[PDB]
Amino acid sequence: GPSVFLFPPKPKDTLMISRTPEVTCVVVDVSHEDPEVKFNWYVDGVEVHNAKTKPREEQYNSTYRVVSVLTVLHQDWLNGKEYKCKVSNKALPAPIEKTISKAKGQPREPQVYTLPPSREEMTKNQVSLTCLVKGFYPSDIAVEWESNGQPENNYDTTPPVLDSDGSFFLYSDLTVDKSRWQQGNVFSCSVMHEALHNHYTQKSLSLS
């Protein structure tokens, strides 16, 4: 029947004080016949009331999607407070409860290393720059790329991989035109993680 997802906020949103992090409670496969969904929210078992209620939207088989988004406070999430969405619908035997919070455990800061293009990489029209990150906990992290205070969006980052010591690692590849690299422009991978000083660090690389 009706199925519930509770998504945590984007790591960038929780680590940047200028952004507003939010938990999202998504209910799918809500029948046309019993479409009303009632959301209850709880922060550490204590009910709160500021949640926003989006209007329903058509889905496949005479079903609706209904969503409810709750703004969280950076420090609440970071302090490990537990967020609960309670979903009630007439077609439900009992209400459905989902629980999300930041992983518990000693925060470990990421170690970042950069890899310039190989000799072969330099023969192509487009070169790739790589950023290796390890040693971090929890797995919540944001990796983005910039050059000259402008975003560089042509990158791909792997999901964090669990390490045998309990921490996490990943890599990120940015592809840029070779002419831009040849010109001498500096490129940076920016890493945001809870355990970094001010949640932010940056490694750079340019043509030698």
Binding site: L15, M16, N198, H199, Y200
Partner: peptide, 13 residues
């Protein structure tokens, strides 16, 4: 001191 990402405020200490 404060960290900034692409002209946007990250965090202060």
């Amino acid at each position: 001191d404060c960290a900034w990402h692409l002209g946007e405020l990250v965090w202060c200490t």
